[PDB]
């Protein structure tokens, strides 16, 4: 059981798991109501207009300058019922992910992936980092600084621009130095993409209407995999990129895909990163874990907490799976590192979650989204934790009929057809 309490958005605050919070990095936001669905995991059922000060409104760009795959609705997630349904939909997706051993292992790694205490200028002192905390306002009026790993927030202007972000440090690259940082995922359980069953069809931009709908549990697990990489500080640099040469339409558009996205999907897409680049990253982050173990061994003082230094050293020994000898010194065992590295990079992939959920999904990241649908996974007659849209002992159980947007047409209301905005590819048939 991943979510022990059933949260309702209108429930009063308590300063523990329901409270108004401020994020230290921004600080200019007015407090927002947040819910703690699990250890180190919070949910903010509001449109993200506060994390990025340069993205403080939901105004869409002019129609011509809009990304072909995008959707705008400034009224979405503005009422208390939408926020309450958003909250129940996100928790239901967490339980569906948790109902698989793959998702249970991913969520376990996310929980114990506490961002490192390395913000002190003194090399022998452990100090928390402002990036990895939030201020929890109490009924007393007092505020308590609480460190956390993951926050689920509603989308910004582009409703379907799901992404996993984090606040950057002034000096360090928290996402690429082993330290890790608190991850903020823009996500919505009320919308899902439309793809096609055939590979030649789904990877062609000119044809396709969105016959099958993506299970939002797979879409959430995708960004959770990004959060898992970034919580352990092993995310691949976004400028490390694979220029696509397998899709002709990708080629002529000059499209390129980051190694982080290819790794996150896994499957056959992860093979575009050659073994030489994979060894480069693995050896690189192995030395980053070595530096963390060295810093822990040199630690003699701790500041900002009533917790013992031995506890904080053991906490990051648990996160990075360090080994300790009779003297108490920490060391990084490379085989245990390869186990943790393979779990975060090869085991937790979108393709594997498709295999565990037994649902239909895009077979590659190098495709073209066909449409976007409005969904409601909260009612049990629409969507279940074990079966998703493919309700057992019904007609939706076979042949992914639950994800079929024509068979199970009452569960999907098409809002925008992306194929029509990819019709400029017709001009290479001359």
């Amino acid at each position, epitope marked *: 059981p991943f979510v022990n309490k059933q949260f309702n958005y209108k429930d009063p605050v308590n300063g523990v798991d329901i409270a108004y919070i401020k994020i230290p990095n921004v600080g200019q936001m007015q407090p927002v109501k947040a819910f703690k669905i699990h250890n180190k995991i919070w949910v903010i059922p509001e449109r993200d207009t506060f994390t990025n000060p340069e993205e403080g409104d939901l105004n869409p760009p002019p129609e011509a300058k809009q990304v072909p795959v995008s959707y705008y609705d400034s009224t979405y997630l503005s009422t208390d019922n939408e926020k309450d349904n958003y909250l129940k939909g996100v928790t239901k997706l967490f339980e569906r992910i948790y109902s698989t051993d793959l998702g249970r292992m991913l969520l376990t790694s996310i929980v114990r992936g506490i961002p490192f205490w390395g913000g002190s200028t003194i090399d022998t002192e452990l100090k928390v980092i402002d990036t990895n905390c939030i201020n929890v306002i*109490q009924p*007393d009026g007092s505020y308590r600084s609480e460190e956390l790993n993951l926050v689920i927030i509603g989308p910004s202007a582009d409703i379907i621009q799901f992404e996993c972000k984090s606040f950057g440090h002034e000096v360090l690259n928290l996402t690429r130095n082993g330290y890790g940082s608190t991850q903020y995922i823009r996500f919505s359980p009320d919308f899902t993409f439309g793809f096609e069953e055939s590979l030649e069809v789904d990877t062609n931009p000119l044809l396709g209407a969105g016959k099958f709908a993506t299970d939002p549990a797979v879409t959430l697990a995708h960004e959770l995999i990004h959060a898992g990489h970034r919580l352990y500080g092993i995310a691949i640099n976004p400028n490390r990129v694979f220029k696509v040469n397998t899709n002709a339409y990708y080629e002529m558009s000059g499209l390129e895909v980051s190694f982080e996205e290819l790794r996150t999907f896994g499957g056959h897409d992860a093979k575009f990163i050659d073994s030489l680049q994979e060894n480069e990253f693995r050896l690189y982050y192995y030395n980053k874990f070595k530096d963390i173990a060295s810093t822990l061994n040199k630690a003699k003082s701790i500041v900002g907490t009533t917790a013992s230094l031995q506890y904080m050293k053991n906490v990051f020994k648990e996160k990075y799976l360090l080994s300790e000898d009779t003297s108490g010194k920490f060391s990084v065992d490379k085989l245990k590192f390869d186990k943790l590295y393979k779990m975060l990079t090869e085991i937790y992939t979108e393709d594997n979650f498709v295999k565990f959920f037994k649902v239909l999904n895009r077979k590659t990241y190098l495709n073209f989204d066909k449409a976007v649908f409005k969904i409601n996974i909260v009612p049990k007659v629409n969507y279940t934790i074990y079966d998703g849209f493919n309700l057992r002992n019904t007609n939706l159980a076979a042949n992914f009929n639950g994800q079929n947007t024509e068979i199970n047409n009452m569960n999907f209301t098409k809002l925008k057809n992306f194929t029509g905005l990819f019709e400029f590819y017709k001009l290479l048939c001359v």
Partner: nanobody
């Protein structure tokens, strides 16, 4: 933690009034505080809040008319109301927390001050 609001009464439509709350037992500038009102026979309505930083936050209950201030020396919160309307009649409380809507265990309230217009 004691809070004593003061300064209510009668105001003919369109006027102004300055409510104050004298705190004791805690530094007022170190907690999130709120102004809450309640009409006879209705529930509470959140009026305003102020951060420990001094940043105030007005709700749609009364925005542009009211300003929430704080005097750190006298340890007193203030609610400067203007352009009053019969919809603003009620008992005005000063309660701990941010966006205080209801009585929550742990929160502290004053006994309120009546404002009739």
């Amino acid at each position: 933690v004691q809070l004593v609001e003061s300064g209510g009464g009668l105001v003919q439509p369109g006027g102004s009034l300055r409510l104050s709350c004298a705190a004791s037992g805690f530094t007022l500038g170190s907690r999130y505080m709120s102004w809450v009102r309640q009409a006879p026979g209705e529930g509470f309505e959140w009026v305003s809040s102020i951060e420990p930083s001094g940043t105030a936050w007005d709700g749609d209950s009364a925005k542009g008319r009211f300003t929430t201030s704080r005097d750190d020396a006298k340890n007193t919160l203030y609610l400067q109301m203007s352009n009053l309307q019969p919809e603003d009649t009620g008992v005005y409380y000063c309660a701990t927390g941010y966006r205080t809507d209801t009585r929550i265990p742990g929160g502290s309230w004053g006994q309120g001050t009546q404002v009739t217009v």
